[PDB]
Amino acid sequence: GDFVLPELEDVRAEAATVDTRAVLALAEGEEPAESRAAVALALWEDRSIGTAELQAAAEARCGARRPRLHTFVPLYTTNYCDSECKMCSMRKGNHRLDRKFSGRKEITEQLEILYHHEGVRGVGFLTGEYEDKHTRLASAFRIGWAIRTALDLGFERVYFNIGSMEQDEIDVLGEWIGREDPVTMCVFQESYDRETYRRFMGKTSVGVPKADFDRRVVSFDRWLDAGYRYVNPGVLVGLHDDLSAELVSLVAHGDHLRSRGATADLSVPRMRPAMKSRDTTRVGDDDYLRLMSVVAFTCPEQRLVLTTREPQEFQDVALGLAGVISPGSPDVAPYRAGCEARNDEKSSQFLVADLRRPRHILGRIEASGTPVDHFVNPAGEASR
């Protein structure tokens, strides 16, 4: 019943039977005969199909989707963490980080800033991942309170990204919400390759909670077992060298979640500067756009999430492939009325490329002709 990693050699054999040109000729309602992971790999490796042409086909295949875009702003509630992800500044071994923690007052104030001054109705809560069971349960309790508080304030969509979750931890968080509340669980596998995953997330049975590959990857299945609906798998582009392997696994994961009746967003965040302890791979824009295009095309009902990790010039090019736009800063309680968000190197998880305030980014998108759901521009008679 739980998700099982596909064997790449099997998907390769099926990809060899896919007619990629006939796939591109499909109407926006119809589905290929082969599996989505196999179709995705075939489109990726057929270089007679240009990346630009692949992106155009993906945007058209997702063009009927309504709403075209909705938004959420990240709110890091703390930068404490018990794990040791080597590409992340919040790793416990990073003794240079200034550790911060948002209480009841600060979380509420940040939510009111985002709601009233940035005009957003979507928010995402983030934490580290913690080792001992009591800390994990206490973390689930606080984030559950934050989700309930956001929903009561009028937030229409709430993401959370707080590490892997077991059944009893989901129970604690779940007591704050209802099974039909608009709440999305985010658990990015980062890499679906166990060797690259272990290289960056560390070795198991050593008090490093994220090193357990299997507890992490089945978190969505525990979430769905409890009766919830919205999920968000992800791949950290730049860890594993073989991008074709990650797109097969991510599409396979999305396809498994869809078969369970889940609504899934798909995230492929690209690496950003951080206080790392291991080098990462720089993925060019053409590979990255081709990756997004192949995922968006094969999974047309699963929105890609695009964030301000990417610079403004890249957002202009890739926004048509996305179904979710997420501007903000990965710093603890960084927002302030009328000021751009803080992204202090001393306390942030990484350095974003676009620090413009969300209401400007989202307002420029709307001014360009794409409405953004869960964004209420605080202009005119809506100002206050």
Q: Which is nearer to ligand SF4, 81 or 322 (CB)?
A: 81
Contact 212, 164 (CB under 8 A): yes
Residue 124, contacted partner among ligand ICB, ligand SAH, ligand SF4, none, CB below 5-8 A by kind: ligand ICB
DSSP-assigned states of every residue in 96-122: TS---B--HHHHHHHHHHHHHTS-B-E
Which partner from the list ligand SAH, ligand ICB, ligand SF4, none does 308 bind, CB cut-off 5 to 8 Å by kind? ligand ICB
| CB 209 to ligand SF4: min, Å | 7
Task: Give the nearer residue to ligand SAH in terms of CB position, either 83 or 244.
Answer: 83
Residue 44 interacts with Na ion (CB under 5 A): yes or no: no
Using rule CB under 5 A, residue 371 touches Br ion: yes
236 binds, among ligand SAH, a copy of itself, ligand ICB, none (CB under 5 to 8 A by kind): ligand SAH
Cα pseudo-dihedral 157, 297, 232, 147, rounded to 10: 0
Quote the distance between the C-alpha of residue 291 and its chain's center: 15
- What is the closest distance, in whole angstroms, from the C-beta atom of residue 375 to Na ion in the complex? 4
Task: Please tell me the distance from the alpha carbon of residue 384 to that of residue 363, in angstroms, as a whole number.
Answer: 17
CA distances from 167 to 140, 172, 174, 223 (A): 11, 9, 10, 8
> Should residue 126 be labelled a site residue for ligand SAH when binding is judged by CB under 6 A?
yes
310 is in an annotated binding site: no
Which of 5, 56, 60, 80 is the binder for a copy of itself (CB under 8 A)? 80
Task: Please state, in angstroms and rounded to a whole number, the distance separating the CA atoms of residues 248 and 299.
Answer: 12
Q: Which residues pair with 305 in a beta bridge?
A: 267, 324
Residue 271, annotated as binding a ligand: no
Q: Which residue, 195, 177, 209, is CA-closest to 246?
A: 195
Number of other residues whose CB lies within 10 A of the CB of residue 244: 18
Integer Cα distance of 171 and 174 in angstroms: 5
Site residues (vs ligand SF4, CB under 6 A): 81, 83, 85, 88, 90-91, 128-129, 163, 210
Candidates 96-104, 200-208, 297-305, 338-346 — which segment interacts with a copy of itself by CB under 8 A? 96-104
Partner whose binding site includes residue 81, from Br ion, ligand SF4, ligand ICB, none (CB under 5 to 8 Å by kind): ligand SF4
Q: Is 78 in the site for ligand SAH (CB under 6 A)?
A: no
299 known ligand binder: no
Q: Which amino acid is at 368?
A: S
Residue 364, marked binder: no
Give me the count of residues in the chain. Answer: 384
- For position 72 contacting Na ion by CB under 5 A, the verdict is no
Q: How far is the CB of 36 from ligand SF4 (least distance, A)?
A: 27
Q: Which does 163 bind (CB under 5 to 8 A by kind): ligand ICB, a copy of itself, ligand SAH, none?
A: ligand SAH
| Whole-angstrom distance, CA of residue 372 vs CA of residue 156 | 13
Residue with tokens 């009841």: 104
186 in a known ligand binding site:
no
Using CB under 6 A as the binding rule, whether residue 350 contacts ligand SAH is answered as yes
Residues of 115-145 as b/e, b for ≥16 C-beta within 10 angstroms? bebbbbbbbbbbbbbbeeeeebbebbebbbb
Nearest Cα residue to 3 out of 216, 212, 275, 294: 216
Query: Contact with Br ion (CB under 5 A): which of 264, 271, 304, 352?
Result: 271
Q: Is the peptide bond before 67 cis (omega within 30 degrees of 0)?
A: yes
Q: Which of 7, 5, 3 is nearest to 192 (CA)?
A: 5
Q: 186 contacts which partner out of a copy of itself, ligand SF4, ligand ICB, none, CB within 5 to 8 A by kind?
A: ligand ICB
Within 158-187, the residues that bind a copy of itself by CB under 8 A are 168, 171-172, 175-176
Instruction: State the amino acid at position 353 in one-letter form.
Output: A
Task: Give the amino acid at 278.
Answer: R
Query: From the list 20, 35, 55, 78, which residue makes contact with a copy of itself (rule: CB under 8 A)?
Result: 78
Q: Which partner, a copy of itself, Br ion, ligand ICB, none, binds residue 47 by CB below 5 to 8 Å per kind?
A: none
Size of the site for ligand ICB (CB under 6 A): 15
Shortest distance in whole angstroms from residue 280 CB to ligand SAH:
8
Specify binding-site residues. 76, 81, 85, 87-88, 112, 116, 190, 210, 216, 272, 309, 349
Specify binding-site residues for [4Fe-4S] cluster. 81, 85, 88, 210
